[PDB]
Amino acid sequence: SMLGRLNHVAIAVPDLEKAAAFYKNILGAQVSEAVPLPEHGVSVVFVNLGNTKMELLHPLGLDSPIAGFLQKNKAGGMHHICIEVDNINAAVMDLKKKKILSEVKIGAHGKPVIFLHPKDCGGVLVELEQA
Amino acid sequence: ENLYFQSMLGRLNHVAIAVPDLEKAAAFYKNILGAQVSEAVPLPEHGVSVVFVNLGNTKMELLHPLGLDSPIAGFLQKNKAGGMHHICIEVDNINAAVMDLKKKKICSLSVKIGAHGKPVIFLHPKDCGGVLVELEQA
Ligand SMILES: [Co+2]
Ligand SMILES: [Co+2]
Numbered sequence: 001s002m003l004g005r006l007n008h009v010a011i012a013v014p015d016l017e018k019a020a021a022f023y024k025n026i027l028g029a030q031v032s033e034a035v036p037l038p039e040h041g042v043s044v045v046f047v048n049l050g051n052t053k054m055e056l057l058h059p060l061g062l063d064s065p066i067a068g069f070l071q072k073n074k075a076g077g078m079h080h081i082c083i084e085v086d087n088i089n090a091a092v093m094d095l096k097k098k099k100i101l102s103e104v105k106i107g108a109h110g111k112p113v114i115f116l117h118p119k120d121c122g123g124v125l126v127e128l129e130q131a
Numbered sequence: 132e133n134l135y136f137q138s139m140l141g142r143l144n145h146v147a148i149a150v151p152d153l154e155k156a157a158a159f160y161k162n163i164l165g166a167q168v169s170e171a172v173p174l175p176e177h178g179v180s181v182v183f184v185n186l187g188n189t190k191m192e193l194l195h196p197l198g199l200d201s202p203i204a205g206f207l208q209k210n211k212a213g214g215m216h217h218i219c220i221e222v223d224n225i226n227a228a229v230m231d232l233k234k235k236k237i238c239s240l241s242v243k244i245g246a247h248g249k250p251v252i253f254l255h256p257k258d259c260g261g262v263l264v265e266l267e268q269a
Contacts, residue, residue, distance in 0.1 A: 001165030005188040009146055009218060013260035022258060026235055027220070028138030049220060051142040051188045056260060076261020078215035081146060083164070083186060098163055120163075122156040122193065123213025124148050 002091050004084035004131045007109075008053040012066045012079045016058040019076070020045040023054070036060055040108045041067075055082075080115070080125035088112045088130040101125075139228055141221035141269045145183075145190040149203040149216045153195035156213070157182040160191075173197055177246045178204075192246075217253075217263035225250045225268040 013019035016034050024031040032046040041064035047054035057079060059067040069079060085091045088104060092114060100120055107113030107129050116126040150156035153171055161168035169183040178201040184191040194216065196204045206216060222228040229242060229252055237258060245251030251267040 003165045003186070006146075006186045006191075009143070011260050011262050019260040022260065026232070026237060026258070027264075028140045030136060030138075049140070049143040054143075054218075073261055075257055076259075077256075078218075078262050081191075081215070095163070100163060118214075119212060121159065122148055122150040123210055124215050 002085045002087060002094070004086060006052050007082040007084050007129055008055045009081050010055040010057055010079040010127075011076060012069050012073065013056050013058055013076045014070055014074060016043055016045055016056060019056045020047075023047050023056075029054075034058075037108055041065055042108070044108065080127050082113075082127045082129050084131035085128050086131050088114065088128065091128060139223040139231075141223060143189050144219040144221050144267060145192045146218050147192045147194055147216040148213060149206045149210070150193045150195055150213045151207055151211060153180055153182055153193060156193045156195075157184075160184045160193075174246055178202060179246070181246065217265055219251075219265040219267055221269035222266045223269055225252065225266065228252075228266060 020031050023029040030048040034043050034045050036043050038060055041061045043058045043060045045056040047056065057066050059070065066079060092104060101117040102115040104112050104114055111130040113127055113129045118125045157168050160166040167185040171180050171182050173180045175197055178198045179194045180197045182193040184193065194203050203216060225242065232239060239252050240255045241253040242250050245267050249268045251265055254264040256263045
């Protein structure tokens with residue numbers, strides 16, 4: 001098998017500051033500072049849960065991919081999960097061979113990623129990232 | 132970063148996904164993605180059947196309604212194709228946690244016995260950024 005550990009769960013939030021402060025000051029999580037990533041059109045806050053991370057996303061730019069998501073879910077909502085694969089290239093070829101959204105691109109962690117359409121995943125947008 | 136950290140929040144225990152078909156969802160993660168998938172476990176006391184997808188560092192729970200009064204039944208009526216439902220974070224002691232939330236004037240959605248036999252509570256997604264968060268005793 002090529003599948004690995006869950007890298008992160010992504011949450012689109014309508015306010016980055018108040019979302020990060022909730023997990024930090026209400027739930028007592030270890031929370032990072034807001035990191036702007038213009039090449040991906042989001043600002044990210046990393047919530048470290050020990051075994052995995054939570055990514056709080058906020059749009060950065062008008063053509064941001066998650067800008068439309070927050071327009072349908074104005075209060076926020078779960079966006080996608082990220083599972084690691086030992087090799088992104090053999091994975092896509094095994095998925096293409098298995099006749100299974102994204103046309104391989106460098107992800108928000110500097111590693112190549114792809115996104116699977118939620119229809120084939122049970123309703124959840126699944127991002128596969130090179131381990 | 133080896134900083135001073137005093138907190139009762141723990142590891143992420145699972146991420147829950149409500150699916151319109153348990154069998155076809157479990158088969159996808161097992162046979163398409165190569166994940167370790169459990170057999171369907173019925174939980175009538177909670178009105179769901181659950182399939183556990185073990186990713187090593189955490190688990191994903193694929194939920195399907197079991198009974199007409201299922202709690203995720205309304206979710207699957209709005210999201211017919213499925214969707215992410217909630218996350219579950221462990222706490223070192225559920226009782227000290229709930230009152231620390233009450234002291235912080237945080238109104239909770241739910242203490243009840245959860246799907247793993249341990250006491251749980253649910254926070255309203257408005258205060259969590261849109262995600263339903265379940266706290267369960269570690
Ligand atoms: Co991501
Ligand atoms: Co749960």
